């Protein structure tokens, strides 16, 4: 008997539709509130979130839907453009989605009448992950079950294609490096590509398979974190191709891994969606056990707030937020 005291979510917001993915804007939108996107069965909702921890005028959470986009298909992944700004004389909302129809959609909006989307075709399998290039915002990387990593301009033209040895499961741009791309493969291989040389720089191998998610630490560009099988795995580059840490994350497989955007030692993992509840575990590298354990009904997405030690997971028709101490 240790009653796993599953912590309640710090905040909970009701949604009009099922949440299948959720992503905070990791960029500065120039607004006081953090931009959040969530994808449902046929819609993408863009919202502003303000928290009492960043703004003493808010009691708890202020959640405001800014815009709802008709998407027509189930959204699987969302990526923010670094050009997204709301405080400008001309606000620009730009994000990309991957969906159940194997297409990418780039949405562009002024929050007024100008609402345009571009459809990008070329993936022959499901797209598992997609990301904008952070610093230029001009390019989108995507990975999928067609065993390709593809690079697109905003015009939907394929600039580059890398053939993978298995399904691509996650993709991340180097936080400081416009031409460095991490691609994580389902067989446990994580590869780094240079887009100027079109070459693989280096690879990492997971001690478990399948690898389901990987993330590049923004606060420490030497750290890579992933989930594979039941474990979370951390590497510190360039010191070794072997993992520095490998520890149990979840009993019934780990699904998502994300680094905190404010702390290089904090990350969250999600369990595979069981029939009733997904477990969420917040970890700190100085501790052998999770510092927080939460639960969501059918956990979908995992994202971190830009400034606060606050993570979000979608579940059923709700967003669940967990704040951790720093």
């Amino acid at each position: 008997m240790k009653q796993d005291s599953a912590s309640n979510a710090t905040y909970t917001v009701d949604c009009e539709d099922y949440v299948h993915v959720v992503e905070f804007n990791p960029f500065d939108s120039g607004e006081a509130g953090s931009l959040l996107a969530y994808g449902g069965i046929s819609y993408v909702v863009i919202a502003s979130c303000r928290f009492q921890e960043e703004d003493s005028t808010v009691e708890g959470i202020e959640f405001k839907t800014l815009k709802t986009f008709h998407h027509g298909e189930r959204v699987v992944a969302i990526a923010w453009s670094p050009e997204t700004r709301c405080d400008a004389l001309l606000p620009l909302l730009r994000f990309a989605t991957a969906a159940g129809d194997k297409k990418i959609r780039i949405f562009t909006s002024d929050f007024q009448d100008k609402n345009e989307y571009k459809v990008i075709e070329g993936h022959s399998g499901y797209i598992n992950d997609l990301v904008f290039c952070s610093p230029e915002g001009t390019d989108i990387a995507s990975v999928g079950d067609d065993h390709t990593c593809r690079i697109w301009d905003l015009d939907g033209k394929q600039i580059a294609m890398f053939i993978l040895r298995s399904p691509g499961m996650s993709v991340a741009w180097h936080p400081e490096g416009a031409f460095k791309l991490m691609v994580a493969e389902k067989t446990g291989t994580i590869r780094f590509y240079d887009l100027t040389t079109h070459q693989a720089i280096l690879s990492l191998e997971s001690v478990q398979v399948p690898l389901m998610s990987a993330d590049w630490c923004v606060r420490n560009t030497l750290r890579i974190g992933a989930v594979a099988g039941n474990d979370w795995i951390i590497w510190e580059m360039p010191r070794s191709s072997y993992p520095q840490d490998n520890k149990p994350a979840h009993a019934d497989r780990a699904r998502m891994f994300r680094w905190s955007k404010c702390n290089e030692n904090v990350f969250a993992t999600t369990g595979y969606p069981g029939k009733m509840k997904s477990q969420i575990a917040i970890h700190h590298l100085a501790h052998p056990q999770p510092i927080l354990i939460g639960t969501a009904p059918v956990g979908s997405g995992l994202s971190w707030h830009r400034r606060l030690p606050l993570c979000v997971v979608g579940g059923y028709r709700k967003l669940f937020f967990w704040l951790t101490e720093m």
Binding site: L89, P135, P175, G177, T196, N220, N263, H284, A286, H287
Partner: protein, 556 residues
Amino acid sequence: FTIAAVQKAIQILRKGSGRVLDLSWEELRKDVTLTVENEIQNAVIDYDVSQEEFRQINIENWCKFYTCCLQYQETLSRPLALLVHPDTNMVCLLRKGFLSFLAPCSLVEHLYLVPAEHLLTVDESVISDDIDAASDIVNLIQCLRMIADYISEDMAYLMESACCHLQSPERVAEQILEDLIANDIDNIMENIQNKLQDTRNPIRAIGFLLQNMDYETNADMEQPQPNTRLNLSTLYGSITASSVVCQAICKISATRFLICRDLLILQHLLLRLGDMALIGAGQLLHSQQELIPRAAQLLLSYYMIRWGSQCLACAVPVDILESNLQHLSVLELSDSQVEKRRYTSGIQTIVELFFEDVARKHFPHVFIQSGASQLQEPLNWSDLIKRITNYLLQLLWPSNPNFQFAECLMRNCQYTQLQEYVRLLLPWCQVNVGSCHFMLAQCYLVAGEGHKALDCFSQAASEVEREDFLEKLIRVEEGESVSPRLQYYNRVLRLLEDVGLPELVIQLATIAIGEASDDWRSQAALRTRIFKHHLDMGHNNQAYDALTQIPDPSRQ
């Protein structure tokens, strides 16, 4: 393009009787992008456009906008008057839209840019006291121009792309030379060979061009005496003068980049021509082994200065700058009081920003050291612009030990431009490697990439005793015999604590204990710091392990 050309081009595309709004540059950029995007959306009649047809429609609409800007620029560029200043010799071209300044060319740019008909009329006595050396330089520059006239736009782009992607410019000059020889329809290689046979010593002429293009400074920039500051601090202090000087650098670096490219291609041609054509078989091969890497380094240095002279500074809010200056003042990287500079909300290049912030404060000294000990000499535009531009080129020089350009970018929160500057510099410049890694580590810390910041801080620690910039970070603790690396790590540890990253503080403090081998007091302080951060994070076992390792019983 003038802002007035761009604003007129937008008004016509809009088909709209809108009043000329004095739009900000960011508003103008947003308005251009939205206007071209609306024309692209109007040109897309069908929902099922292929990615390639969409790309082609995008290119065509940008080309239409660009052509519209060119026609308005041509109209605004029409010369109306010449203003010649009698006392200062300043020459000003009054165009319909704008004002240009005429600055005298340096010797190398003059000989390269003069029409071929007039090159034979240049007084050889202006080039060198040695008539034979003057003739060799003129013949060499004719060879460079013959090469320049046959370089296609694709070959010119291939060299510029190679510099951007950090490819060896020597190998790329060899490829362009292969393509030039493969396409030699007009026997130009024979004409270049015939003209090279007229050169008595091509090595001496190449060495002379490289020397006049070299701004590497020996570190004797004497520190300023305080008493003459008050009347000369305002010389060339206007935004108009700042931009004219920075445009002089942009043009000089652009022309000298072309000269270095064409010179590298000519040096590879001289290597291929081999023992068959030039009286000097053994001296040519050995001297070209020293001169080719030098021409490549000058090409990369002028590419960097050209890139920086064209690179726009980011608009930074005053509150973020004041907070960054408070954080840098904790580092003692800032002696300069914030004179309440209203950032005049104009677009500036990173070189214009550097000129106004740093280089300007040193010009009164350059004026005094050069024999102007009489406050009675009349101001001469031609001499002064040349001196200012040469001095600013020395300060912008990538091998400059003072490292002031990168320091100015860090101080003004120009992190993206500083990352790109350091990316372009590190592969080939070995002078300020530690200082580059330290600046890059600070950029990664602001980006939230704390692990990459720690790796870069650890690399910077190796060069701390060699580089004057890193030595400045150490010189203020007048305390007993600590290793300069341990003082540096203590400084980086204070900075990681102020940002609130306890995991990285522990990793760095563990490394710093390895360097503290002989000082039990510093080891006690570092282990107490590791204990505190593990305790704060709740790592009870690691906090207890750290406690057992503390050598001081009182702190334990």
